[PDB]
Amino acid sequence: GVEFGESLSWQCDTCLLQNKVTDNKCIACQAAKL
Amino acid sequence: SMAAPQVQFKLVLVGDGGTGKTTFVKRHLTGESEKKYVATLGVEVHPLVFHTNRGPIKFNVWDTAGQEKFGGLRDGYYIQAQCAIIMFDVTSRVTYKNVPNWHRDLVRVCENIPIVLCGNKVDIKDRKVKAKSIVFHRKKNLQYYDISAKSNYNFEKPFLWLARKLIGDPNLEFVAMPALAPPEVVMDPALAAQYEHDLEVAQTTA
């Protein structure tokens, strides 16, 4: 199959959720992007 | 803060207290050494990498800190989950009776995400919830596996099924098993064969 590296947001450093760039706050754990 | 592209999924691991959720997620050694504690939610997020024939995939598994013993989990626990494991204990019928409640709570927040149902502690000889009784998954497009966290029995199976569903590749494979904590108990080979047969029979019988 095709490698995900070819085939394929910011990541919260507290809970690892991938968030949309419009959000400056993690929608799960509320950790700020900054 | 923003962490410093990789396929990764938020996986919520739910089920009654005492069913083995923590013991199960902890079998994956790197997921335990690299786990993150989330103070605001009382969660430990374990990043579990599996190496597939198309590259690595990480299930970021959300393990509770026991709060399920006292009520439902809060919305932030579930939010943006992409898949789930519902666990029960095959020596405790009540934990299986509660499976529909966990499923309802999941779907209420996350809708139709892929879910695997896991019956844990199958290493224990005096098993109460047997294959013929395990029917909830047939009703709801859920996949079922017997597991034994303490013996690593079938550890990879829920993750492989979820990966195939999430990626949309029925032929996806794991090229190697993850490095797992050595079994603490023996999964009796004959018992495993019986349970696999019992599941086969339940699935093919007319």
Ligand SMILES: Nc1nc2c(ncn2[C@@H]2O[C@H](COP(=O)(O)OP(=O)(O)O)[C@@H](O)[C@H]2O)c(=O)[nH]1
């Ligand atoms: N024999 C056996 N005991 C298990 C297994 N998984 C968990 N246990 C035990 O069940 C108890 C609850 O496990 P725990 O991981 O804390 O469950 P949780 O409350 O669902 O996180 C503990 O005493 C575990 O050692 C298993 O696969 N086999």
Ligand SMILES: [Mg+2]
């Ligand atoms: Mg636990």
Ligand SMILES: [Zn+2]
């Ligand atoms: Zn977060």
